[PDB]
C-alpha cells in the first residue's frame, strides 16, 4: 500500500529527472542544421523485376548478403528463395504451419529461418549434403506467435514473439541462451546493429528498447509514437534507428543523444507503416504503407522525395540490398517487386 | 562460356520443376476452405468440433474439404495475429446463449470482427451453441434477460420465427432476441460484401457440418456471381 505509492512516486520523480536531462542536451533540431545542405532532388525508381510464384499473401522477405538472393514467406505455407537477377526461383520449402509471419536469411547464406502462429522458429539447412532442404532445428520456447527473427551467426539467432519478450537462441543446443524482458505489449520487429553487439526492438506499447546481447539488459528505452510500432531499422553507422507505427508517421531516434531527431509524416497519409529501411548512405528512408504504396523520405530534411507504386494490396515487407543497389518490396497481392 | 550456359540451364530446369509443384499446390489450395473458429471460455466451441500456438481440424462434407483453425496458444490481445485471416472463407463464431452475463462481451467481439479493415469482407457463420440450457434457464424464471438487456421487455417474437414443435413460447422469444442482437450489428455496416448466418445449436446437434457446408455454398456463390458482374 504505502510502499507501492512511495515506489511509484520515486519512479515518477526519477522519470522527471530523465526528461530534464534529455531536454538539457537540446541545442538545435536536425532540421535547423540541415538548412545548408542541398536537396536530394526527385528519386524515381522503376520496377526492374516482378517475382510471382506465391499463392497467398506475402508476409516477410529478407535479402541475402550477396545482394542477389532473397527469401520470402507466404501464408499458403511456402518459403521461396529467388535469384533476383534472373527471376528464377532456387528453392520452394513447404512449411508445416501455414501461418508464417517472419523469415530470415543467414548472413553466410547456409540457413533460412521462419516462424509464425505456431510459436516456433524453424531453421532450414539450405546447403544440405544431399541437396534437399530440411528442418535443421525447431525452437519451441516461446508462448506466443513469432513476429521477427534475425540470424547472428550460424549458431545464434535472436527472436521476438507476441509474448512480449525477445530471446537469444543457441541452435546447436536448441535452448534460449538469454531472454530479454521489459516490453509490455507484443514485440513486433527487431533490428541488429552493424556490429551485432546490441539490437533495438519495437513492440505494441509505443516504445522501443535497446538491448545488450551479451549482458541481456535493456540499456535504453525510446518513448515516441502514439500507437503500435510495426517496423524498426538501424542507421548504417549504427548510432541511430527509425521506427514506423500505426499512427501514420516515422521517427528517427539517436542512441547517443537519447532523443528523437526527426518525424516523417504528411497530412495526406493516415495509414500505418508496415516496414522501414534505410539507404546505403542513410540518406533515404523507405517506408511501406497500408495504402498499397511505399514512400521515399529524405532522412536529413524530412521532405518526401519519391513514391513507389504498383502493388494491388498493402505492402507488408521492404528491404534494401547490402550493396545498396536495389530495394525489394513484398505485398499482400503475393508479388515482390525489385526497384532501382 | 559453356560453363555459364550450363549453369543457367540448371537454374531454368530447377525453376521448371518448382513451378510444376506450385501448380499442383494451387489446385489443392483453392479447392479447400479455411475457417477461423473463435469463441470464448463457455462458448462450447470445442463441442462443435466433431472430428500449441494454433489448433487444426479437417472435416469433409460431400467430398469437399474444410480446414478449421482454433488459435488457443496466444494471449488475450488479438489485434495483430487476427490479420492473418483476411482470406478465410468464413469465421465460425460460437457464443453460449445461456450466459446473459457474458453475452455483451460476445457482441463487442463480434462488432470488432465485423468492422475491421482487414476482415471487412469475411462472412461469419454464427452458432448459438447452448439452447437446451437456455430453455431450462427461461423455464425456471429465476434469471431475467431484462436485467442485462433492458430492451427485451419490449421485444416480440419475429413473425418469420419457426419454433421447434413443442417448445414453450417464452423460450422462442428469448431465442430470437439473442439472435437479433447479433443481426443488428451485422446489418448496421455490412454493405453487401459479407453476411451473417445465425444457427441455433445444442451439444447433441449432429447436423452442424452440413450447415457450414450450406453456408459455404452461399458465400462462394455470391463471389462467383460478383465476378460475372451479375450482382
Amino acid at each position, epitope marked *: 500500500q504505502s510502499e507501492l505509492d512511495q515506489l511509484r512516486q520515486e519512479a515518477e520523480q526519477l522519470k522527471n529527472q530523465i526528461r530534464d536531462a534529455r531536454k538539457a542536451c537540446a541545442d538545435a533540431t536536425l532540421s535547423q542544421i540541415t538548412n545548408n545542405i542541398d536537396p536530394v532532388g526527385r528519386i524515381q525508381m522503376r520496377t526492374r523485376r516482378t517475382l510471382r510464384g506465391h499463392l497467398a499473401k506475402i508476409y516477410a522477405m529478407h535479402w541475402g548478403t550477396d545482394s542477389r538472393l532473397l527469401v520470402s514467406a507466404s501464408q499458403d505455407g511456402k518459403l521461396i528463395i529467388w535469384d533476383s537477377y534472373t527471376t528464377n526461383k532456387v528453392h520452394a520449402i513447404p512449411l508445416r504451419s501455414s501461418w508464417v509471419m517472419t523469415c530470415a536469411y543467414a548472413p553466410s547464406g547456409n540457413y533460412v529461418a521462419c516462424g509464425g502462429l505456431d510459436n516456433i522458429c524453424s531453421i532450414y539447412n539450405l546447403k544440405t549434403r544431399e541437396g534437399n532442404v530440411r528442418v535443421s532445428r525447431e525452437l519451441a520456447g516461446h508462448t506466443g506467435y513469432l513476429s521477427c527473427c534475425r540470424f547472428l551467426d550460424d549458431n545464434q539467432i535472436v527472436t521476438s514473439s507476441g509474448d512480449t519478450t525477445c530471446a537469444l537462441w543457441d541452435i546447436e543446443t536448441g535452448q534460449q541462451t538469454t531472454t530479454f524482458t521489459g516490453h509490455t505489449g507484443d514485440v513486433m520487429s527487431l533490428s541488429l546493429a552493424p556490429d551485432t553487439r546490441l539490437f533495438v526492438s519495437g513492440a505494441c506499447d509505443a516504445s522501443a528498447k535497446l538491448w545488450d546481447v551479451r549482458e541481456g539488459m535493456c540499456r535504453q528505452t525510446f518513448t515516441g509514437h502514439e500507437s503500435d510500432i510495426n517496423a524498426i531499422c538501424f542507421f548504417p553507422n549504427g548510432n541511430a534507428f527509425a521506427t514506423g507505427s*500505426d499512427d501514420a508517421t516515422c521517427r528517427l531516434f539517436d542512441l547517443r543523444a537519447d532523443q528523437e531527431l526527426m518525424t516523417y509524416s504528411h497530412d495526406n497519409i493516415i495509414c500505418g507503416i508496415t516496414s522501414v529501411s534505410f539507404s546505403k548512405s542513410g540518406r533515404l528512408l523507405l517506408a511501406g504503407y497500408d495504402d498499397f504504396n511505399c514512400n521515399v523520405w529524405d532522412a536529413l530534411k524530412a521532405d518526401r522525395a519519391g513514391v513507389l507504386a504498383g502493388h494491388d494490396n498493402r505492402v507488408s515487407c521492404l528491404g534494401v540490398t547490402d550493396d545498396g543497389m536495389a530495394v525489394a518490396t513484398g505485398s499482400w497481392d503475393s508479388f515482390l517487386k525489385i526497384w532501382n | 562460356t559453356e560453363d555459364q550456359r550450363n549453369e543457367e540451364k540448371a537454374q531454368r530446369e530447377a525453376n521448371k520443376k518448382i513451378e510444376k509443384q506450385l501448380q499442383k499446390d494451387k489446385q489443392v489450395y483453392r479447392a479447400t476452405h479455411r475457417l477461423l473458429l473463435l469463441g470464448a471460455d463457455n462458448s462450447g466451441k470445442s463441442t462443435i468440433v466433431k472430428q500449441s500456438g494454433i489448433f487444426e481440424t479437417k472435416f469433409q462434407v460431400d467430398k469437399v474439404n474444410f480446414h478449421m483453425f482454433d488459435v488457443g496458444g496466444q494471449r488475450d*490481445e488479438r*489485434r495483430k495475429w487476427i490479420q492473418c485471416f483476411n482470406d478465410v472463407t468464413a469465421i465460425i463464431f460460437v457464443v453460449d446463449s445461456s450466459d446473459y452475463n457474458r453475452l455483451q462481451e460476445a457482441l463487442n467481439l463480434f462488432k470488432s470482427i465485423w468492422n475491421n479493415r482487414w476482415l471487412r469482407t469475411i462472412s461469419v457463420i454464427l452458432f448459438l451453441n447452448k439452447q437446451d440450457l437456455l430453455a431450462e434457464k427461461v423455464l425456471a424464471g429465476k434469471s431475467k434477460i431484462e436485467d442485462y438487456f433492458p430492451e427485451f421487455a419490449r421485444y416480440t417474437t419475429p413473425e418469420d420465427a419457426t419454433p421447434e414443435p413443442g417448445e414453450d413460447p417464452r423460450v422462442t422469444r428469448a431465442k430470437y432476441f439473442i439472435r437479433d442482437e447479433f443481426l443488428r450489428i451485422s446489418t448496421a455496416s455490412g454493405d453487401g460484401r459479407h453476411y451473417c448466418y445465425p444457427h441455433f445449436t445444442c451439444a447433441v446437434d449432429t447436423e452442424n457440418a452440413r450447415r457450414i457446408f450450406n453456408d459455404c455454398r452461399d458465400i462462394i456463390q455470391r463471389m462467383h456471381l460478383r465476378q460475372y458482374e451479375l450482382l
Partner: nanobody
Amino acid sequence: QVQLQESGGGLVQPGGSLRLSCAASGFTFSNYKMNWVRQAPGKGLEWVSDISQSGASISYTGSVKGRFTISRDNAKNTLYLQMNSLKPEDTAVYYCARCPAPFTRDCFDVTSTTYAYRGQGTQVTVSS
C-alpha cells in the same frame, strides 16, 4: 509518452452520483475512440461505454444504460463519465482506455488483462 490519468471519486451512498475525469496526453485525442472499462472485485474487466472521435456515436452497456453518460472535450483532451443512481453492484475500479489505432471503429483488446493504452484506474465504492 502515451499516458491516461483518471481522477474520479471514493465512497458514495446508494442512489448518489459521481463524475470521473480522464486527462489524456501523449497522443492526438481527437483521432481516437475512447472507452470506459471497469473491473469488479473478484471479477474480470468488462466494457462499460465508449464515445466516438466526434462524440456523435455513443454506446453503453446494458446494465448501466440510462444511468451513466459518456462525453469528451477534444479541445482540452479530457474524457468524462457521469454516473447517477449508483447501485451496490457498481463498486469497482474504473479505467479510461483508448482504442489501439486512430481513425478506426473496431477496438480490439481493450478489455485484456494487460493493455498498454489503459489508465491506472480509479476506485469507486458504494456502500451504506
